[PDB]
Short mmCIF file of C-alpha atoms in Angstrom, two decimals:
data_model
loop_
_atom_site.label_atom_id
_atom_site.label_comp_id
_atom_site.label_asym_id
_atom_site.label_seq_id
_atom_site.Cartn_x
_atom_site.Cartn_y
_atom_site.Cartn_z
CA UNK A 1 -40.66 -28.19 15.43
CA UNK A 2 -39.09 -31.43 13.86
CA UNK A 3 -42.01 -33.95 14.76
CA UNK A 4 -42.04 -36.24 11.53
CA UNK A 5 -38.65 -37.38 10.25
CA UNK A 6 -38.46 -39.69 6.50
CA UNK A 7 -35.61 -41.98 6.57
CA UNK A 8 -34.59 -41.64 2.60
CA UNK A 9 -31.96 -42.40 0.14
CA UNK A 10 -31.19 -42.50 -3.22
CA UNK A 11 -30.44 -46.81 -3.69
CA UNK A 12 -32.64 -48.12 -0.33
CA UNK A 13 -30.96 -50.62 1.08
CA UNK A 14 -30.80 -52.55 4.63
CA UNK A 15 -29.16 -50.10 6.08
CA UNK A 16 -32.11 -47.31 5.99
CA UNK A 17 -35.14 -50.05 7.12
CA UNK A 18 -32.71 -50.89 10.27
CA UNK A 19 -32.21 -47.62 10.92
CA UNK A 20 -36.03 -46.78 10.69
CA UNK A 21 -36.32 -49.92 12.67
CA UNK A 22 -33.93 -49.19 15.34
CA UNK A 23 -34.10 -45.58 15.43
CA UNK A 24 -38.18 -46.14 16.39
CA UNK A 25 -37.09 -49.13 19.22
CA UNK A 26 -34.84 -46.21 20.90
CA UNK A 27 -36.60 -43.22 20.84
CA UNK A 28 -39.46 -45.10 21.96
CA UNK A 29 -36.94 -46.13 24.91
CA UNK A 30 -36.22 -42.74 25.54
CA UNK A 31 -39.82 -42.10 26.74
CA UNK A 32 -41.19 -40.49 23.64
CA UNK A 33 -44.97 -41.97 21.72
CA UNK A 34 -43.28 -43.18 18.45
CA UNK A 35 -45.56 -44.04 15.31
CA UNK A 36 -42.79 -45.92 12.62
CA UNK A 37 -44.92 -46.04 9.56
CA UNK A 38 -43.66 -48.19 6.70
CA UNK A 39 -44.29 -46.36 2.97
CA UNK A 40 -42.50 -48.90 0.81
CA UNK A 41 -44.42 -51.63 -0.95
CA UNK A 42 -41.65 -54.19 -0.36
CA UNK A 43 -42.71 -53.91 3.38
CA UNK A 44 -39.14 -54.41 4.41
CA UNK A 45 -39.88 -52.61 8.07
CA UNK A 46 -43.16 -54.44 8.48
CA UNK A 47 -41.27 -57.85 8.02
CA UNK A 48 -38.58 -56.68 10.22
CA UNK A 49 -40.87 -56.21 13.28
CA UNK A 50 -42.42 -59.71 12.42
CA UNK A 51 -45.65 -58.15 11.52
CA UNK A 52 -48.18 -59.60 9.14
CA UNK A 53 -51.33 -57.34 8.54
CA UNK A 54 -53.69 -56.92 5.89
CA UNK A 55 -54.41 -53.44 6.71
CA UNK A 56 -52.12 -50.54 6.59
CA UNK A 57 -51.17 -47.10 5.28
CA UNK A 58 -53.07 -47.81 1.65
CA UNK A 59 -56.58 -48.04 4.13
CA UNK A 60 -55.25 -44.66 5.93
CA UNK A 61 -55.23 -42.96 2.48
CA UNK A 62 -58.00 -45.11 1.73
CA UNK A 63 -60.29 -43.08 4.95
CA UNK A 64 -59.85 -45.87 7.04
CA UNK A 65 -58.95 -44.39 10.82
CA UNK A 66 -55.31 -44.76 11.96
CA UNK A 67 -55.96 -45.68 15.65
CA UNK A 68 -57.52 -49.13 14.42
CA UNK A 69 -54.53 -49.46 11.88
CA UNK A 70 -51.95 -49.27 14.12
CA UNK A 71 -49.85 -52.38 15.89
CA UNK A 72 -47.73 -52.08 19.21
CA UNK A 73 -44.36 -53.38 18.54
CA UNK A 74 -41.37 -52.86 20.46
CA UNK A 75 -42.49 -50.13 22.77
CA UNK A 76 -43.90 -47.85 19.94
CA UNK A 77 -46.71 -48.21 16.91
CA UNK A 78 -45.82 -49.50 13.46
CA UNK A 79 -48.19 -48.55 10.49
CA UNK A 80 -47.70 -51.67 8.26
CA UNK A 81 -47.30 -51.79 4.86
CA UNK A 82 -49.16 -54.56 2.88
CA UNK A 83 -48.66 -55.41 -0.98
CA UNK A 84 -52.14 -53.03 -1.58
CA UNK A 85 -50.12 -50.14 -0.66
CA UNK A 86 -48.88 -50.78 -4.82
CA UNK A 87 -52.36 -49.36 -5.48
CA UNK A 88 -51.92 -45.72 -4.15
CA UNK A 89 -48.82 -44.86 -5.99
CA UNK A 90 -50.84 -45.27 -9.37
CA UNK A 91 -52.95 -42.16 -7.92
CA UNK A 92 -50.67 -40.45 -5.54
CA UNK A 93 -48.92 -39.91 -8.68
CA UNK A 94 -49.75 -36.01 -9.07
CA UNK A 95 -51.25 -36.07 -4.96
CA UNK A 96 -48.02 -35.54 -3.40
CA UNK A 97 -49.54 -33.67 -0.06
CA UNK A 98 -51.80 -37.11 0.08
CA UNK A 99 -49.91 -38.52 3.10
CA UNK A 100 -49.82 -35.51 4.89
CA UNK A 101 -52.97 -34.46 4.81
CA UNK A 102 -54.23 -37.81 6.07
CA UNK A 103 -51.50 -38.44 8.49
CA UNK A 104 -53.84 -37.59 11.60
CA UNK A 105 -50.68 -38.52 14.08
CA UNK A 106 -50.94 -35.60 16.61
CA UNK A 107 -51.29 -38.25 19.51
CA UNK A 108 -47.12 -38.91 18.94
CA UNK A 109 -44.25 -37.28 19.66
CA UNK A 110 -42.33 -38.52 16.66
CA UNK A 111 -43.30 -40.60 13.20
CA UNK A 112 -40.78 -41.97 11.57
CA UNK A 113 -41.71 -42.60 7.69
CA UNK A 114 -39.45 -45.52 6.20
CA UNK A 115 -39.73 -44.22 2.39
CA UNK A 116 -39.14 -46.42 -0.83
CA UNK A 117 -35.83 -45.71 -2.54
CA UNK A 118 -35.92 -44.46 -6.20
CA UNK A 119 -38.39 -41.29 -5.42
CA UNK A 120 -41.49 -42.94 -6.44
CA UNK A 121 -44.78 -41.30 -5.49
CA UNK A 122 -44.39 -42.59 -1.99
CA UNK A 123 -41.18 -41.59 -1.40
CA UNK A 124 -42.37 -38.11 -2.53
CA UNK A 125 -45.26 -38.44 -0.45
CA UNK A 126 -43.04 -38.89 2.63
CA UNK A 127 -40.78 -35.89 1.72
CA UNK A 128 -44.07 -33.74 1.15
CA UNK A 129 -45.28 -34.81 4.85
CA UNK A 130 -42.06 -34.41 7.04
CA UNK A 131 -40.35 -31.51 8.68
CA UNK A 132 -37.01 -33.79 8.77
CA UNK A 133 -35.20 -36.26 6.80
CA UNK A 134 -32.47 -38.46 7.63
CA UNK A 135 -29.97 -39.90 4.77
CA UNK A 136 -28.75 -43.44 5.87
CA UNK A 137 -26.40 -44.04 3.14
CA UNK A 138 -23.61 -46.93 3.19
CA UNK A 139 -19.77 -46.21 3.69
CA UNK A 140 -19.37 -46.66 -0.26
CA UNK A 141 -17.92 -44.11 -2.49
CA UNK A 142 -20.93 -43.99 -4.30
CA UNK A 143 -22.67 -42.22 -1.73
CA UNK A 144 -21.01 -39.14 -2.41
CA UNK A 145 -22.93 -39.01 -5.57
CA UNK A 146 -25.77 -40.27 -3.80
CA UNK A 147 -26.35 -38.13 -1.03
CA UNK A 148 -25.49 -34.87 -3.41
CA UNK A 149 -29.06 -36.05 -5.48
CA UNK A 150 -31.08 -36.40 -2.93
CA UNK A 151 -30.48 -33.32 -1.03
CA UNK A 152 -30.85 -31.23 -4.34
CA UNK A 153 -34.44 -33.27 -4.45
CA UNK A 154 -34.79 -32.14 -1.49
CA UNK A 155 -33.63 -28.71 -1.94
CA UNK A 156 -36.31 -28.73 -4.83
CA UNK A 157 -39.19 -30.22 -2.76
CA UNK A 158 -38.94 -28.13 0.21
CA UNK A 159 -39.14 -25.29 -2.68
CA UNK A 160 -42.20 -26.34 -4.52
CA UNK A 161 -43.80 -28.56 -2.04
CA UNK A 162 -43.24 -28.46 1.31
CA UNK A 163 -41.42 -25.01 3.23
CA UNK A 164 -40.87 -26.89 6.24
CA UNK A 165 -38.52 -30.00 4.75
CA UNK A 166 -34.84 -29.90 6.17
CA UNK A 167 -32.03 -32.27 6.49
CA UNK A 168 -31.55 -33.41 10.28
CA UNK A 169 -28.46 -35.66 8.59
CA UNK A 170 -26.74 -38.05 7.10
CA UNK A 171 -26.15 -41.29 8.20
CA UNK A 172 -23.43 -43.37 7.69
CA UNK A 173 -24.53 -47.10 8.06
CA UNK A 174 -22.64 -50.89 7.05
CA UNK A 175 -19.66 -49.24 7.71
CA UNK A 176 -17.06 -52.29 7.65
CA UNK A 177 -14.81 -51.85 10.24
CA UNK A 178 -12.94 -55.04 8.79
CA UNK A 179 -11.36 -52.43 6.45
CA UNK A 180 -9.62 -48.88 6.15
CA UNK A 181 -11.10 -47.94 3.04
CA UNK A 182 -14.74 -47.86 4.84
CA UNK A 183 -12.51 -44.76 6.78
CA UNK A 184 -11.44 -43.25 3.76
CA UNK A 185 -15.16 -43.07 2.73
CA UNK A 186 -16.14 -41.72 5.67
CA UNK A 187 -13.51 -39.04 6.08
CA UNK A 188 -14.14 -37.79 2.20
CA UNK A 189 -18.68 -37.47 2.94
CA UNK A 190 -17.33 -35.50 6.56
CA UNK A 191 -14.87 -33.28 4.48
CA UNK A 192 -18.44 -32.66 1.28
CA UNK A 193 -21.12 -32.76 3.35
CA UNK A 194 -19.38 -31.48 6.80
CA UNK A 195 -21.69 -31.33 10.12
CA UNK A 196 -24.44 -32.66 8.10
CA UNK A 197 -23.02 -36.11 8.44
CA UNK A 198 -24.04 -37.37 11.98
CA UNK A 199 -21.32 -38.42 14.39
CA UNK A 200 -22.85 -41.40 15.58
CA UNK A 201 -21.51 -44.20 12.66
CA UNK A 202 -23.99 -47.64 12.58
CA UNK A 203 -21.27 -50.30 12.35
CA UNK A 204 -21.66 -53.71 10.10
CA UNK A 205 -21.97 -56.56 12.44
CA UNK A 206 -23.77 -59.75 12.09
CA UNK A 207 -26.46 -59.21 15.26
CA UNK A 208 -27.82 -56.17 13.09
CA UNK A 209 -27.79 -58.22 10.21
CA UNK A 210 -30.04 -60.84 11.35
CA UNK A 211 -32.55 -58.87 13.72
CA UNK A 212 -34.79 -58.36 10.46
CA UNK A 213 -34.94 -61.90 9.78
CA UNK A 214 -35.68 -62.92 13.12
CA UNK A 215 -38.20 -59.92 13.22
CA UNK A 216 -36.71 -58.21 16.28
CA UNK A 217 -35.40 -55.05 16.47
CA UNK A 218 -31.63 -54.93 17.47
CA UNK A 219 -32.93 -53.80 21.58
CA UNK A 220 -34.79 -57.28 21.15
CA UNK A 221 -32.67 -59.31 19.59
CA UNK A 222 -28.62 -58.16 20.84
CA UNK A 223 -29.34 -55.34 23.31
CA UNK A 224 -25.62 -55.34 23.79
CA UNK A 225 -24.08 -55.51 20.33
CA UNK A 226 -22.13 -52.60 19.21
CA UNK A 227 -25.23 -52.00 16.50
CA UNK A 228 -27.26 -51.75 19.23
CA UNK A 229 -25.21 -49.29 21.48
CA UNK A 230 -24.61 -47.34 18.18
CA UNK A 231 -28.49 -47.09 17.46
CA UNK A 232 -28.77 -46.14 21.22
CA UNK A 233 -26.35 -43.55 20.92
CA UNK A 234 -28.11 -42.24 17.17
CA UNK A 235 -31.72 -41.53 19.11
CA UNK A 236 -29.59 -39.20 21.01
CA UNK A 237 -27.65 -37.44 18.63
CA UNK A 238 -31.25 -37.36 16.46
CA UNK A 239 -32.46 -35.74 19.62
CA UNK A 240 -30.37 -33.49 19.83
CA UNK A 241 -30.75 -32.27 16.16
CA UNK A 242 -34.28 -32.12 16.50
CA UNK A 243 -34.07 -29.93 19.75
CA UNK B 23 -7.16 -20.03 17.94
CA UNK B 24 -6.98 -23.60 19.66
CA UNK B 25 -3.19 -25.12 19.01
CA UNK B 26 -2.57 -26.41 22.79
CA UNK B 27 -4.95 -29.29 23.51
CA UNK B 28 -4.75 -30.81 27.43
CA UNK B 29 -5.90 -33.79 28.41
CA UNK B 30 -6.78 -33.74 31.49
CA UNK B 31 -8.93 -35.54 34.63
CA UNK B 32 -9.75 -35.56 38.16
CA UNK B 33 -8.23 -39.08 38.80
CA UNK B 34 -5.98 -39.84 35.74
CA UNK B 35 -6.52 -43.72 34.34
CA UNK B 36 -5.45 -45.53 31.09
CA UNK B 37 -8.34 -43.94 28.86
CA UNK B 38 -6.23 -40.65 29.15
CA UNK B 39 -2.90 -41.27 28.76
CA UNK B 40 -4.17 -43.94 25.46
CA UNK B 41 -6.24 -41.37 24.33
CA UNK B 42 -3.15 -38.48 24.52
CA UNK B 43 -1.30 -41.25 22.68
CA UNK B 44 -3.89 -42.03 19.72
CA UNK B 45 -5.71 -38.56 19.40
CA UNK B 46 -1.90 -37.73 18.90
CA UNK B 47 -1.79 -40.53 15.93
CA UNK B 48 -4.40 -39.51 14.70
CA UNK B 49 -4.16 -35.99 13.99
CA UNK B 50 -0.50 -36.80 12.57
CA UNK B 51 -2.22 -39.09 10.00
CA UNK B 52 -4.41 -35.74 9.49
CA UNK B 53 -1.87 -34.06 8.17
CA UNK B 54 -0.80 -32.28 11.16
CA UNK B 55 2.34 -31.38 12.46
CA UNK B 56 1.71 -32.67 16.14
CA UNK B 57 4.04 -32.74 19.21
CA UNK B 58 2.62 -34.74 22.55
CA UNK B 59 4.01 -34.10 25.51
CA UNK B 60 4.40 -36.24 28.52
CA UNK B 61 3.87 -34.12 31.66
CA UNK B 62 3.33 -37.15 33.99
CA UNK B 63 6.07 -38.00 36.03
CA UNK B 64 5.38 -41.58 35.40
CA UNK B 65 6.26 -41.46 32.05
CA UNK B 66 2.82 -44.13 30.98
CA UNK B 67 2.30 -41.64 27.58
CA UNK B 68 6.29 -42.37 27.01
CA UNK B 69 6.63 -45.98 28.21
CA UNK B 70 2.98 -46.11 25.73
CA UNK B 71 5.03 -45.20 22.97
CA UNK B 72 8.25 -47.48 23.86
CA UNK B 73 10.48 -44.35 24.04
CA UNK B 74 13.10 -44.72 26.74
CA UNK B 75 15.00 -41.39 27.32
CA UNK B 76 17.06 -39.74 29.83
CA UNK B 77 16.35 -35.75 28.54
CA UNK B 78 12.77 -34.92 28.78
CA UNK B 79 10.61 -32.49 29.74
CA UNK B 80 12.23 -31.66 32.50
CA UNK B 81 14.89 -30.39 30.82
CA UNK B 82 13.00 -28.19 28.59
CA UNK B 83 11.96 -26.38 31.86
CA UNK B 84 15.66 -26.41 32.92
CA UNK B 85 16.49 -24.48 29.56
CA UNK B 86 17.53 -27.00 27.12
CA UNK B 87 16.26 -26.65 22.78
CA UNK B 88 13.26 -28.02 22.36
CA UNK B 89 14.14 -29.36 18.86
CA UNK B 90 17.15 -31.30 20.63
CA UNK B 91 14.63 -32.67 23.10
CA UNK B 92 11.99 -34.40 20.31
CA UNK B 93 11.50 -37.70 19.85
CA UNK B 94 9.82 -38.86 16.24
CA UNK B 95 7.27 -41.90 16.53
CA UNK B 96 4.10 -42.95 14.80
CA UNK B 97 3.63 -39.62 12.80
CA UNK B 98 4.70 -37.57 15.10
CA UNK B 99 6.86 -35.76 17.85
CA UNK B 100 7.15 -36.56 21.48
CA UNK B 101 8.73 -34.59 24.14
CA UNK B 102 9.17 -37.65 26.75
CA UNK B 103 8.95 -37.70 30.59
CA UNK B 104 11.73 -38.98 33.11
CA UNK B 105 11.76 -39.94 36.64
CA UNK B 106 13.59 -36.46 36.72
CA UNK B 107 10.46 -34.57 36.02
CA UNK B 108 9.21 -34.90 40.03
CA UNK B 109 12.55 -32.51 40.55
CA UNK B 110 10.62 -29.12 38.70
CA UNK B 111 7.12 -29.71 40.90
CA UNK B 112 8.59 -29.08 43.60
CA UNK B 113 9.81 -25.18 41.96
CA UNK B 114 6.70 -25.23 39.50
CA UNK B 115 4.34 -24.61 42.16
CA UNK B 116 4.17 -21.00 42.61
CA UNK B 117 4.89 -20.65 38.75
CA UNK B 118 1.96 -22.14 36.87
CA UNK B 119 3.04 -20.46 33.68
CA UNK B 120 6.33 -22.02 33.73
CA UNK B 121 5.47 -24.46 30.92
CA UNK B 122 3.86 -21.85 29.00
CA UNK B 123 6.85 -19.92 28.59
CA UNK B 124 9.14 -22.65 27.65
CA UNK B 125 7.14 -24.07 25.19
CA UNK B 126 8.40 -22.98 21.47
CA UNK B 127 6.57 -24.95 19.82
CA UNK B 128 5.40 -22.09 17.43
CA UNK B 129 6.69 -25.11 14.03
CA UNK B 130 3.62 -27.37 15.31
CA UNK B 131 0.21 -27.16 14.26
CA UNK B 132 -1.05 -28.76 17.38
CA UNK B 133 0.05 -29.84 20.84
CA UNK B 134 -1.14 -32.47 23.05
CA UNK B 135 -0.59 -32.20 26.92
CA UNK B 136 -0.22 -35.29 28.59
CA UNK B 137 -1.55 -33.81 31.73
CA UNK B 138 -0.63 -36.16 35.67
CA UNK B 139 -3.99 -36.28 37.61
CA UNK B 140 -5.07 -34.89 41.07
CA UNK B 141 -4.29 -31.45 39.62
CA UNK B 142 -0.22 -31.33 40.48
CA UNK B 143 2.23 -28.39 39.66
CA UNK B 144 2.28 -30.35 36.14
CA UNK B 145 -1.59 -30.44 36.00
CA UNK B 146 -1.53 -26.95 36.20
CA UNK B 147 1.32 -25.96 33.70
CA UNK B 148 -0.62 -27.85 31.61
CA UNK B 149 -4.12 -25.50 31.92
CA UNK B 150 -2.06 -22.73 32.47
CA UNK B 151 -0.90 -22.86 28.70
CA UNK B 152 -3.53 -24.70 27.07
CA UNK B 153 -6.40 -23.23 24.81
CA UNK B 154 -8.24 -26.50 24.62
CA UNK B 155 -9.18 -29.12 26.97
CA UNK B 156 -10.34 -32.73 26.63
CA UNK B 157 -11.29 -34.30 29.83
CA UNK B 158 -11.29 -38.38 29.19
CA UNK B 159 -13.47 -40.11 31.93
CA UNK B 160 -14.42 -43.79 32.06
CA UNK B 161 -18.42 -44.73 31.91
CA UNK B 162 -18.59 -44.95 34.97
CA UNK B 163 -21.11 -43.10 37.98
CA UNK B 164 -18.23 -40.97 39.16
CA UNK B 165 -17.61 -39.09 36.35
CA UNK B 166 -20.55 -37.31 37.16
CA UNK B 167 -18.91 -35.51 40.09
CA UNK B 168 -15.28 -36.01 38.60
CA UNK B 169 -16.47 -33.81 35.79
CA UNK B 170 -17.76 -31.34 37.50
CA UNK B 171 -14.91 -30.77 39.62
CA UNK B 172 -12.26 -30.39 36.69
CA UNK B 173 -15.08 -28.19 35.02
CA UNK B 174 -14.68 -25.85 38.04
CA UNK B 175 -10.73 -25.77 38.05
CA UNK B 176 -11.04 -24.84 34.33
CA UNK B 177 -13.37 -21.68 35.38
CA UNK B 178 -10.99 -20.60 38.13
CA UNK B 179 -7.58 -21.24 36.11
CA UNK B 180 -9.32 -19.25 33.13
CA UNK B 181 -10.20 -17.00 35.43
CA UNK B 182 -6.76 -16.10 37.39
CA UNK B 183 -4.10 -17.57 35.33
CA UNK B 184 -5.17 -17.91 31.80
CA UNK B 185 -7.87 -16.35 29.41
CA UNK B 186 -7.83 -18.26 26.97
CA UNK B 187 -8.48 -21.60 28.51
CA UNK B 188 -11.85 -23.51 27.42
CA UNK B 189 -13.48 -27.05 27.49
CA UNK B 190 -13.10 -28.70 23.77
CA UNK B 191 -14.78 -31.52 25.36
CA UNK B 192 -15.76 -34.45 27.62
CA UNK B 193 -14.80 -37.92 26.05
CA UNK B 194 -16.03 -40.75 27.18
CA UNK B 195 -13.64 -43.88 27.54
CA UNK B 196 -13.60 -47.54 28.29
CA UNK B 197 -17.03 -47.88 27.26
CA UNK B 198 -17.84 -51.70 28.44
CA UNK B 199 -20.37 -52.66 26.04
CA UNK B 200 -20.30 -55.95 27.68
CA UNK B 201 -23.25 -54.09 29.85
CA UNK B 202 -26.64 -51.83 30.03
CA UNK B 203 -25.00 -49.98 32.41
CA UNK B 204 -22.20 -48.02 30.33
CA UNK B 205 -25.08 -46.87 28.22
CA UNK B 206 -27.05 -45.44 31.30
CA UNK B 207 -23.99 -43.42 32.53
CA UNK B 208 -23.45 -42.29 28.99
CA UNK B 209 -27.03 -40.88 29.24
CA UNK B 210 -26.57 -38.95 32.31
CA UNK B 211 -23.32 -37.31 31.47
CA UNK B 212 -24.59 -35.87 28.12
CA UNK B 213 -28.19 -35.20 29.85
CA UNK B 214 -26.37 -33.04 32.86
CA UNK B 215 -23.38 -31.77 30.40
CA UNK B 216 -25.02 -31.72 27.15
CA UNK B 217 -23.45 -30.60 24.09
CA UNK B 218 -19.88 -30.79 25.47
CA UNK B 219 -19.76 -34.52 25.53
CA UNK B 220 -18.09 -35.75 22.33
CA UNK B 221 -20.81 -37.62 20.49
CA UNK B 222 -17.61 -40.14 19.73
CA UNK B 223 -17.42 -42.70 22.18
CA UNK B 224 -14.18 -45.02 22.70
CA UNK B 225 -14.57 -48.58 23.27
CA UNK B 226 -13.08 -50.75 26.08
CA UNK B 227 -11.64 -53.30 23.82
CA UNK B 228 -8.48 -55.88 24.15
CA UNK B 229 -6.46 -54.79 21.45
CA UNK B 230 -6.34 -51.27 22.58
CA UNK B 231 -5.84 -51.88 26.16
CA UNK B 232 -2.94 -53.79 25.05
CA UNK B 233 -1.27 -51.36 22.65
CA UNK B 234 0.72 -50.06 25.67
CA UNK B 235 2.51 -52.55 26.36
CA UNK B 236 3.79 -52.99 23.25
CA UNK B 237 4.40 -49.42 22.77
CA UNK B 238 2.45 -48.63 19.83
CA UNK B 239 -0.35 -46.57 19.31
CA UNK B 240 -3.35 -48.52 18.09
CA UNK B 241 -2.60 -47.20 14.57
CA UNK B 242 0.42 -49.35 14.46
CA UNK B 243 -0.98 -52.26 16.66
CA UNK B 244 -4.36 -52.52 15.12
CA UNK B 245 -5.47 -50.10 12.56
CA UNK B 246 -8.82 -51.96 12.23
CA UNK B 247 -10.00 -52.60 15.61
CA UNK B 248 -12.68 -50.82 17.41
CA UNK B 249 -10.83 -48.27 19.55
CA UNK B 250 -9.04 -47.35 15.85
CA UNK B 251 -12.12 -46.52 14.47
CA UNK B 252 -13.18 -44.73 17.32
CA UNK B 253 -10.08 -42.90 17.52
CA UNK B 254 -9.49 -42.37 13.74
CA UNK B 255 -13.53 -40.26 14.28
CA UNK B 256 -12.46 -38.67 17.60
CA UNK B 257 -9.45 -36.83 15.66
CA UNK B 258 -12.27 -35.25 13.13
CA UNK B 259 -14.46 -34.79 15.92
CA UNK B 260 -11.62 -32.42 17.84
CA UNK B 261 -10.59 -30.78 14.65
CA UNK B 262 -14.21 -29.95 14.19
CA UNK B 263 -14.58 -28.71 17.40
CA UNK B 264 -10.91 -26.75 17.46
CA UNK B 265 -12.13 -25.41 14.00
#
């Protein structure tokens, strides 16, 4: 049963922290206890959500309990990420089952874990702890390349590290519907990576864009924007995977 | 193996007769040999695509080559309707496979049926020699019950007048994302019919609701607007599901 999810790629990018963002604001909306916890240093999801803690996940690996970490956001609980989760990744160097074992979630139905880019101890740390991951890559021909590394690291993790690590899917995000080439990119990772790709396609519009900075998630912010009926429409199809 | 594709609902509307038109485009700019055929007597698939003939489908019925009948646009061939068509309803009912038998269309790779509403003699030719059927509804409460009525015509034509007859899926059109309310129907129809709602989504938009009247598919009219995108995913999304 596909209970935590990472939201991983090869590059980062905006497109995977508003889909971590988003993805959290709709499942939550969809009745289910969501915990979005943010594993990258930058904090990119905790300054989306307008959040400014001093405590966060380095204090839940540090023994500190989660239930007094935690801040209600948007419907659901974010796990912030301060710049002291730096520290950690010095030592969860060669503890890549850390997370896991101190992830004491079983009060939610999903956690979402928004994972650095670059596989740095964290992001391994996030790929060690979840049963599902979800690729939000951008409608560039790069991602071909991309996507093809990180699902042999994850071929290669669920091997050596963690049995129960699967793809739920790619997602195809920024896709610039100014354009026919972001088509052409699209068609060419649906004809590689086939029903791994999810149908659901996050479109680049200028509502999305600006949620982060205004530290609202896209529900908040443009409840109405096609970003927003897109990332409605993704908590389903992610539903429906998971099922 | 799926070839004949019918698009067909309980009370007709734009959505299908623009989605018979750009599903059509679509799969032509797939690759695929692709004839559509206008089986309304009103001719709105035709007058869509700014074809003006005097032989049509009627004619096919009444004997004449189909390859004399063809007319090439966007891509593709269409077999046009007349105000002559009404003539053959009135000797079509009581021969549902009528159309099946006359249709040599053994050089295409696929075949859209431009199907009239309220289930006619023409609705049924149409299931009667279909494999595949797409049922385009609007978001709206409606197609709850609208649904479930064509799914029950599709269980008793399979059942009595052709075997190989099956759903492909239920496509959801006109999607106002002006409102909250398009995505709470959305909800419900995949919630009551699940997996056979097509995860892609066309949206009501003002460049494709004006592509008829200019008869041109959306391709030609405006390759880079919303309902082109949409309809550009929908044609992987039925090959996927035809596959």
């Amino acid at each position: 049963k596909v209970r935590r999810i990472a939201l991983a790629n090869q590059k980062g990018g905006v497109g995977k922290t508003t889909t971590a963002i988003n993805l959290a604001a709709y499942l939550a909306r969809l009745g289910k206890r969501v915990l979005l916890v943010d594993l990258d240093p930058q904090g990119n999801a905790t300054s989306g959500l307008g959040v400014r803690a001093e405590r966060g996940v380095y204090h839940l690996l540090q023994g500190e309990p989660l239930e007094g970490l935690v801040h209600p956001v948007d419907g659901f609980h974010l796990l912030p990420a301060t710049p002291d989760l730096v520290g950690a990744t010095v030592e969860l160097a060669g503890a890549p089952t850390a997370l896991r074992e101190a992830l004491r979630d079983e009060g939610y139905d999903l956690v979402l874990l928004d994972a650095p880019p670059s596989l740095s101890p964290l992001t391994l740390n996030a790929l060690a702890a979840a049963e599902g991951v979800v690729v939000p890559v951008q409608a560039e021909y790069y991602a071909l390349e991309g996507v093809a590394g990180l699902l042999a690291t994850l071929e290669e993790v669920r091997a050596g590290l963690n049995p129960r690590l699967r793809l739920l899917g790619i997602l195809v995000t920024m896709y610039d519907g100014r354009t026919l080439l972001a088509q052409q990119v699209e068609a060419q990772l649906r004809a590689h990576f086939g029903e791994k790709v999810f149908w659901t396609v996050i479109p680049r519009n200028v509502r999305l864009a600006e949620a982060p900075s205004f530290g609202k998630t896209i529900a908040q912010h443009a409840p109405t924007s096609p970003g927003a009926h897109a990332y409605r429409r993704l908590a389903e199809e992610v539903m429906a995977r998971v099922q």
